[PDB]
Design a protein around this ligand. Structure first.
Ligand code: HEM
Ligand code: HEM
Ligand SMILES: [Cl-]
Ligand code: NA
Ligand code: NA
Lengths: 712, 712
């Protein structure tokens, strides 16, 4: 069947805002995974998982009769899709059990890994998510082979359809770089937001850059793809050496033997794939990467044997049975155990990407420190493992169960405890009134509250107003946040805070993070009153103020908005049409198209635009909450033409007189161009729509103010 | 950005079951369109509409200073997408304003039509759907120009994203037949369920079959396409002559002057398209179809000029200014007014398809009767116009407003009015008790009430259990419905109904239509109890029994399920894979992926399979409401392979022993193969999920029993 996407390939795709509907979710609408998981017998699951580790199934026999390695690869892949650029991928959604991830090349035979876990999933049911299970299984594999994990958090709720993610433009799996959809430019610049070197790879090519077996080169890819997945040099080394401490690769024969990935397989494959015609096609004849490396002498036990082999040998270029570039210790004793035949033994082996830890100068200082001190190694790897598998879970208030590390880590963008009485309705009222009495404008209040709350992304549940980090580096010096304006607003708000807090009894006081949002709420009430409408904007206190010290300034950089359709803001020129970038920002803010539309409309007329630009400000009554944006946008009496100066700026002229009425961007005009968006603009541009616009707007305003409030 | 479709195009698409969610809908989830339209001043709109008829706009000047003709083609096009095969398309959903219909070649310049209607839409807001306005405007165009309409029902609710319709496989707009994706094979067989002869056309080519101007061949395509949109010869001729009594075609210059269809237009065109570079682009210079025909001396007035001109001249093949095949009267005077210059008249002209009404033997006779008896012409066209525009609104209880025809039309599959008191709860109990005492099996009861209820489709809101049409021709003789068993079940139910009704006073009685559904419920209560669950199934009485005479046998034949995955029924071998046909039927039944999963699960184990086939009956306790289907399907203990005899039947063998456990169809297994459906299967095959599965299935059962119950 021919689709709108066939006919009109370049059109906005809005479907991405409308995933995770009550329709696709088989759980009741009242279902709460947190409440389900906090009555789970976590101990009882881990015992089942421990037993599993050494209970081989003939359809996928365990290497060394212990699955631990397989399950560490599986949990590491589940978490290793994650890009800091957008916070998309990661373990958090369990998105490995769905297309495309479930059928990537790098995720080959993890289908068997998950299939092994069905009977434990089946047993415990809704009380443990697949998403929690995939991580917990990795943690139990490590514990079962004598490694102390740093902790575990439940509360990764299952999703029920594929995340809509940009994995790349490439139309061939594992396509080498230089192609018609090359993700590499310049001096090997990997394109944002991508954090892999090839379509269907987790991070880098184990044979080396585009198969070139040079461990210096490879280290460039490893540093890059890992920095892009939140991991520094030390964390990278800990994670690679720590993992490649366990199990083995599988390359027993040619790759040509392997059949269709799960999404392509027969119906009768019941969701498995890479069915192999090579001998038994499993256990000792298993093909997965096509490489045949077994790293340590105790593949099913925590050791420091990896770095021992690594440093204690010289290494020779060789080819797996599948024809794949790997390395073998030159003139070594057959010390490494076979996985299935106790009589055979193999020389030590390495990937190009393992030698990277040795031959990259900066990795080598870290690798040698860990070699000499396997207790430093074991602590790094544990911390790195925790971070890896919890990077995308959001604030510590989400973390469920009895194994949550009590140590607060910098990467968790931590929020101080609240020790004191919160402000009540009467207080909120008093403070809103004080904000307005100050002389702060609707536009200053609404712009500040927006800049603060709009850093949130449900992708990795980072950002949001909580913690007042807009007052700190680097949020407070972001172009989009109008630094000098922000400075005055905040300096004014902090006087109101100091006064209010100074007058209080019973140790009651208000965070600056509460007041920035209260102020932005005062501004929306004033704006409604400006349009002759008395509304109360909802407000939930209990935010706290993170310090500059509680804030990693490097980790904060990916949360900088460089496109904000809601502030008619572009920082530079992009391949991507601004309107596509708008749908992106809206996805991250968790907004439906109806919510995106009502929100952008109100903001334009509230003066939320960056630099008080007139683009999209389709009102004569600015700082009044009205549906002017839509009425004016959809007015056939106006005619719209691209400017001579700027093709992405438009003049709206009276169709009769040729009088200039309005200017606007693609972000503004798309609401009267896009079939489905115009349809929505129409509802809010209709005569009967003043009440519904104001009501919907306060709603999606409150939703964005509360995006990062998991403490409720 | 490569997607899951790009990688795996043949993979089932569940998104079609998860459209029309509360997420994409901008109206609150309490919003009732019926109650907004019941408060609407219908008169005030029709008044505003009448004014519009002759309020020309610079940007699309009205032909003859009256838009009536343009608005009648806009109405007819909204309704003209309808196929009887699946009831999809039609005017019921205002789908013309969305891709792809909004950008079809045959809807060229109708963007302008809809645009003209904005200010009225804007005025009356939510109280009139776009869907109701497009048809109402068509009606007021006819009333304006002196044609009395049979009437008008409102209550077509606006949709908010594209319906997911198969319009064909061609990847070139208007592609002629015999292409790599031809919708025609053999002796010009149009592939079901398509009702147009080329991609982006309503019914036929106006130049004639694949641009060949033979009005005798053209006649065949018209008879076919209109047949396929619910219209016999009499209604067809009434409708073509009815329409082409008004307005003109637009072919002022060559089609190459016409630019991007709306969906492809730049953002500045604000949702309009086909911008022409010929002269002024509009009015006298209008290109739409590239044909230049005016049929009547009075294009803005109801006449009997059409048949007059048709029969009154011999016709001469010529070419529009665009190079298109049309016809011009031989040696006729210029009696036809120009639309813009009083100083010009033109000879009478016709389309190849207009001449079809004359040169087709069967059409000629109805054309002659209409010529001779213009009172019959008028009445036929009035009825065929009401049918065209109300075909897909479903049962008469859905019809809102003061202008609803009192006259009950065979094509509306009418339901008699309930005169008498309904069975109460006490009565239902006593009836379910007698059903179960009869010795009707669970399988018999669930099969029958499924057979009845599941004929329903929300596409065109036809079918369902109301009317007990399962007891009539042709439903009672359908293969899917197991004629002989059905005979015996109904026979027994009627004895019970006859006894119950015979006992009663105050003139209370139960329809057979009610009792069939009640017994299905009794069946489902018995199956719960067989599984040791105490369940009551909800049951709403009020169904009535249609007579044979109230049931068009021919029109009922498009509701015959040649595929029902819910009964593992396929009538023969289809190019389309059965699992697609299952999804197809789920959409038609208004079912979510979860609801389809739950329902098929229960039905399998309840004995609802055609011919008592084992295919997918994964349980040892048949006729007991359990999640056996899911637990057994997802049992990794079982290996599945296609049979030698049938690639479409599968064997479930113990992975250890080789002993056959099960057989399944593609429909059974797809739940173990599709990654999103398997996700769903897993929830219901879990060990905590036996109660949830029963409740979820009683819910979707009672939904399907109530699908056609707009009388509530
Ligand atoms: C540059 C980074 C990395 C590369 C190129 C890499 C590459 C590979 C390759 C090619 C395999 C063979 C898969 C097979 O054939 O079945 C493998 C296996 C494995 N990797 Fe990685 N890996 C990397 C990082 C990591 C990390 C961070 C972890 C864990 C924290 C990890 C844990 C494992 C484990 C446990 C296996 C063995 C699975 C089994 O027992 O069957 N790797 N790796
Ligand atoms: C075989 C069936 C039909 C064919 C091939 C056909 C073809 C055409 C064509 C080519 C146009 C010119 C479009 C343009 O250039 O603007 C047109 C106009 C029109 N048709 Fe049809 N038509 C058919 C049936 C009908 C029916 C059933 C109706 C109404 C019930 C209808 C009502 C009209 C009207 C009102 C216009 C005039 C639009 C205007 O004045 O701007 N047609 N038709
Ligand atoms: Cl539930
Ligand atoms: Na994420
Ligand atoms: Na329909």
């Amino acid at each position: 069947g021919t689709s709108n996407r066939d006919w009109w390939p370049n059109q906005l795709d809005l479907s991405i805002l409308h995933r995770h509907s009550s329709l696709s979710d088989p759980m009741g609408k009242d279902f709460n995974y947190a409440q389900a998981f906090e009555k789970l017998d976590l101990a009882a699951v881990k015992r089942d998982l421990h037993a599993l580790m050494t209970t081989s199934q003939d359809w996928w026999p365990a290497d060394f009769g212990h699955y631990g390695g397989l399950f560490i690869r599986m949990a590491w892949h589940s978490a290793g899709t994650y890009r800091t650029a957008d916070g998309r991928g990661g373990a958090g959604e369990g998105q490995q059990r769905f297309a495309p991830l479930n059928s990537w090349p790098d995720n080959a035979n993890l289908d068997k890994a998950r299939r092994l876990l069905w009977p434990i999933k089946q047993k415990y049911g809704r009380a443990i998510s697949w998403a929690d299970l995939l991580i917990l299984t990795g943690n139990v594999a490590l514990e079962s082979m004598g490694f102390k994990t740093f902790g575990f958090a439940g509360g990764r709720a299952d999703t029920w359809e594929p995340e809509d993610v940009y994995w790349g433009s490439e139309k061939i799996w594992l396509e080498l770089s230089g192609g018609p959809n090359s993700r590499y430019s310049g001096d090997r610049q990997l394109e944002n937001p991508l954090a892999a070197v090839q379509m269907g790879l987790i991070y880098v090519n184990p044979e080396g850059p585009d198969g070139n077996p040079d461990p210096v080169a490879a280290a460039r890819d490893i540093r890059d793809t890992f920095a892009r997945m939140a991991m520094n040099d030390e964390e990278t080394v800990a994670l690679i050496a720590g993992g490649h401490t366990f199990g083995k690769t599988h390359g027993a024969g040619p790759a040509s033997n392997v059949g269709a990935e799960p999404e392509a397989a027969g119906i009768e494959a019941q969701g498995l794939g890479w069915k192999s015609a090579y001998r038994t096609g499993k256990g000792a004849d298993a093909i997965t990467s096509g490489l045949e490396v077994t790293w340590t002498t105790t593949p099913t036990q925590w050791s420091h044997n990896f770095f021992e082999n690594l440093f204690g040998y010289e290494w020779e270029l060789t080819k797996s049975p599948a024809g794949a570039h790997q390395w073998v210790a030159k003139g070594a004793d057959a010390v490494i155990p076979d996985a299935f035949d106790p009589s055979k033994k193999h020389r030590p082996t390495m990937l190009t990407t393992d030698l990277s830890l040795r031959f990259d100068p900066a990795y080598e200082k870290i690798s040698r420190r860990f070699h000499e001190n396997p207790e430093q190694f074991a602590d790094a790897f544990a911390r790195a493992w925790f971070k890896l598998t919890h990077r995308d879970m959001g604030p510590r208030a989400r973390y469920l169960g009895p194994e949550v590390p009590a140590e607060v880590l910098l990467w968790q963008d931590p929020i101080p405890a609240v020790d004191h009485p919160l402000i009540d309705a009467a207080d909120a009222a008093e403070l809103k009134a004080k904000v307005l009495a100050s002389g702060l404008t609707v536009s200053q209040l609404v712009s500040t509250a927006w800049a603060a709350a709009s850093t949130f992304r449900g992708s990795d549940k980072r950002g949001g107003a909580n913690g007042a980090r807009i007052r700190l580096a680097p949020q407070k010096d972001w172009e989009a946040n109008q630094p000098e304006q922000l400075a005055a607003v905040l300096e004014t708000l902090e006087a109101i805070r100091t006064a209010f807090n100074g007058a209080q009894r019973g140790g009651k006081q208000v965070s600056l993070a509460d007041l920035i949002v209260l102020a932005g709420c005062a501004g929306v009430e004033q704006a409604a009153k400006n349009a002759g409408h008395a509304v109360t904007v909802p407000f939930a206190p209990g935010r706290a103020d993170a310090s500059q010290e509680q804030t990693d300034v490097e980790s904060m950089a990916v949360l900088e908005p460089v496109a904000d359709g809601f502030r008619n803001y572009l920082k530079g020129k992009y391949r991507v049409p601004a309107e596509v970038l708008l749908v992106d920002k809206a996805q991250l803010l968790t907004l439906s198209a109806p919510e995106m539309t009502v929100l952008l409309g109100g903001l334009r007329v509230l003066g939320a635009n960056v630099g008080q630009s007139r683009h999209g400000v389709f009102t004569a009554r600015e700082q009044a909450l009205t549906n002017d944006f839509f009425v004016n946008l959809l007015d056939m009496g106006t005619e719209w033409k691209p400017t001579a100066a700027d093709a992405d700026v438009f003049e709206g002229r009276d169709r009769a007189t040729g009088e200039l009425k309005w200017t606007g961007t693609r972000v503004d005009l798309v609401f009267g161009s896009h079939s489905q968006l115009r349809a929505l603009a129409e509802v809010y541009g209709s005569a009967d729509a003043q009440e519904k616009f104001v009501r919907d707007f306060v709603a999606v305003w409150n939703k964005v103010m509360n995006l990062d409030r998991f403490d409720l």
